[PDB]
Symmetry: D4
Subunit: 160 residues, 8 copies
């Protein structure tokens, strides 16, 4: 019932990307919350969200942002929980600004960063699942089944 993963993003425009994280957590039956938290437009909301996350029972935060993408890193500054960052693709620089803004954190405050775009959102959810599976045997079984099906679904040759 109570959420164990928080998915956060700075804008509705980020949802086109972050929806892939939401869908995968739901597929794996991982209770979660999905919210908008804007690092620059709602910085006090961010501080409160991140600093209370652990006491609220969250175990992992998945944060997506694009451009000068500060949401994952500032989240990580305020929580001891693992924070996973999804670089959202930007218009001009194709997410390279997003990527460098998120992955290049200073020693002492980590953000586990995934690929630019939808792939990264899906993989943030899978990485969160991998973390939770360490201490949830039922989920561990669901995740192993999921990975096995992924492997079995790969064809032997292309449709030419």
């Amino acid at each position: 019932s109570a959420p164990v993963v928080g998915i956060i993003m700075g804008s509705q425009s980020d949802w086109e990307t972050m929806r892939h994280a939401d869908a995968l957590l739901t597929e794996l039956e991982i209770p979660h919350e999905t919210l908008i938290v804007a690092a620059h437009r709602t910085p006090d909301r961010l501080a409160d969200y991140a600093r209370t996350a652990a006491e609220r029972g969250l175990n992992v935060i998945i944060a997506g942002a694009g451009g000068a993408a500060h949401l994952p890193g500032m989240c990580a500054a305020w929580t001891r929980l693992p924070v996973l960052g999804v670089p959202v693709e930007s218009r001009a620089l194709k997410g390279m600004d997003s990527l460098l803004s998120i992955v290049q954190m200073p020693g002492g405050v980590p953000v586990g960063t995934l690929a630019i775009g939808a792939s990264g959102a899906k993989n943030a959810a899978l990485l969160a699942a991998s973390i939770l599976a360490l201490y949830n045997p039922a989920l561990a079984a669901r995740l192993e089944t999921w990975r096995a099906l992924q492997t079995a679904s790969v064809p032997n040759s292309p449709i030419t």
Copy 2:
């Protein structure tokens, strides 16, 4: 006098760069404070610094950071004062990470960004001076003199 510019940086390792901003403000006799404020390692210190800057009488904030450089942008999130950002040169990516994480602010929260490195630190101080000069005539004259000396001192041929 009470400071009217705050120079802030995330680490002692930024000082090699940000000292150029400090020196310039001193040269132009602009009262200022020079502090370490770490966006990631001291986020509550940052929130407090930025949100109280205006009531403390600061007029401009100069913020320097390298890598995933969030200090200028998060400062701007908490203050209506103009915030000027200095990308510090990072070891691997030579400040390109610094530059993009500072300049690419989405619309609604600006950071006026200067060049990577020492040039950017000097120019953040000069840009702060040009802002203050709009409503301080004595400083405006000192800034005019500074720019005039810069122009007049350029040699005509290389040695």
Copy 3:
């Protein structure tokens, strides 16, 4: 009545970007002028515009250009006023040439640079407003209201 901000750009093609600066100054009731000044095709026009800006009562110049983008920097060479630069997105290099051409000024002649594209134009106007607000209490109040409304308009969760 008399303009206190000048918005300048090198071409009509730049207007698609710089119109966002114009609109925001108008929203905040900041008197301004909006002109075409081409660094390469009208260099004497630029010299005259920049060197007379202060005596004409301008307080801030917002300059946009793309490609080998020299308009903001050459403006700054000729005026003591703060100059803010907007990198206009270019076709091949997506504004990276614009950005580096504008932001990498030598020590001694500053240009306060904003994001590539529309975001940068909007933020140049907001930064200009922040500067003017230091010595205009009515504008300072309008700007604080504007920022507060921005913060209040952020939803708590995405439309899924």
Copy 4:
């Protein structure tokens, strides 16, 4: 105690970087193993290491590589454990090749990627610690202390 984190790297030349991960895990008293596993030069060693990691009791793998950096991704292909990737700074391209070859994993096989270089190695260890802390209360308290000391130790002004 039996290791719960494996730190692996493709070469001795990566050790200058990955030693920072090793030191951090030691500081936090997290039992770990530190090994060379080369994706290209010892691919069967990699397959064996990754596929048996869970049954050996590992909880997290930290993998560092430079250049065409395939070690973290291929590790993740063979294990359901979380795999954290450290891009090692390469000579010519300063770790940009390392970074893109690690972080740009297609959907379905994740690698949580940290910064280029020593910062990334330290942060992979801290991220592993934060994962383990979710279900080890004594470690969680030591990690809290570590983060608190980091925050409290930041000076207020540069020297």
Copy 5:
């Protein structure tokens, strides 16, 4: 009859690119097989494919992948045969991630890398043909004819 070149790729999406290699081998009458082998989703399939390639009679492997593109390099780790790599164009980073992931192999395990995209696929097939032509005189003649026709087909001036 029996294949002497293997063309492998990680996904059906790669076929839009790798089909150009397949077509050129067919044009030059080089027997080959075309398969899907996913480095990350079917890593045991890859190990088996690469380690048995020589004993199965393959002489050259052409491998295409995009993004964090590991298929060519991991193939090369498991075979003594020459491995040629085709960087498939990726959405955000335009194949620059593909290119660097493939070409920047450590000393000791080579991948001969071709251009991003369709050009690279065509050239991987031509390079494979060049290799086989060293010890197949009939193919050597076909390849020389092919190159000669290419040269003769270049017009002297553009259609204006």
Copy 6:
């Protein structure tokens, strides 16, 4: 003799690079002047230099600058003479900023751009020589000799 090529650069720090252009013109006995002209620090000096270049008898201008490198383009704005641009290697971005700010001129005002660094300075001088050689037969013969010696002097094997 009166100069027919002007070599200009924004700073003494550019001289390490631009000296290669100066040396080449001297070697080919092309009368020239070598000057500092700063686009940002001495913009009126630049306008005057460029607008009077043709009437002073200059035929080609070689302009070198680093960073936000505006000197070649603004020179070309004020003269119909051919302007050749040398991107000087900058500290952080290794001349990539220099290169893009010089070469990406919009249509209507050209700058013929050479390689980043010393190679580009040498080649700007050679390109200027090849322009002058079109209407100076003695120089054309000296340039032929120079290119012939370059070709003939390449060794057949490394030492």
Copy 7:
């Protein structure tokens, strides 16, 4: 009558870009030839074209190419004439491969390089005109008129 500028390019696909050079030379009444010369597919044609250019009366060569763009540099290797290079925009890398392939010539063999794309083609023609104008007074007058009209045609403000 006889051509004094040669415009060369490696493919018909380059014409979309190089046509802007052709049009400007025609506008300025500069006699020229426009040809296809492929560095990689017709290397002997290139050697012959470049090594005979001066004796044929050419004064400037404008060469365009994209990707691994070798046509301008190899032209310059074989002629003492000034060679101007136009980087043609490539699909994946947006002409950055074209640009670096052309501009980064070794000391001793120059190529005067212009902008990526149509702007560069137009400017190669203008630069060629500037060179020819040094020893053709009538053209010098036409070029000064052209530049003056360019300056006079810049509006004072945008259409908003």
Copy 8:
């Protein structure tokens, strides 16, 4: 014996890199020649070298160049032999110019491209060896031994 691989490079400055290809071919006892051939400074030497390579009995050409690196591609234009390209690390752009000017060959004339720098030179020699091994059984066995020793010699832990 008569050479079956030609190693060519544009300058003595490339030798620091290309010596790694030479050493590897020597180690595997592959008869080869090692020469300077400059695409821009000696274009007729290049045309002659490439067009006669096959009739001279060469089987593979390894070509190294930096900057605007045209040597491998122009070699491939004149021969049907496989041409392998080594991007030499350039001073300013760290071989990114070298890499793009070699690898981005349009369809119809291939160059098999290796990594920037010494790794690429070593790997061009190994790739040439793997090509030759297809039809030389003694060499194939020596190459098997070489790869086996590489794999077996990787240490299990860092020192």
